[PDB]
Symmetry: C3
Subunit: 29 residues, 3 copies
């Protein structure tokens, strides 16, 4: 259970970073 | 508290999926 | 470890509010 919760948080952290990257590209590119 | 944390992570998941789909729309005009 | 997860979760909540707002702006030019 603990490992699943860490994995999910880690995955969410990567998804925000991907989304901010893409937003910046759309705004400025 | 564990259960509150899991709900919060599920909320966050629902919100980044929504935002991903929004960004996609923006990418296509 | 638990405390750290909670702080990371709060951080992420702030980040997705920020990105939600930014995306609302970009949607409207
Ligand atoms: Cl566990
Ligand atoms: Cl595309
Ligand atoms: Cl702890
Ligand atoms: Zn596509
Ligand atoms: Zn496409
Ligand atoms: Zn709106
Ligand atoms: Zn509008």
């Amino acid at each position: 259970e603990w490992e699943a919760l860490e994995k999910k948080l880690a995955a969410l952290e990567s998804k925000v970073q991907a989304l901010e990257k893409k937003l910046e590209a759309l705004e400025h590119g």
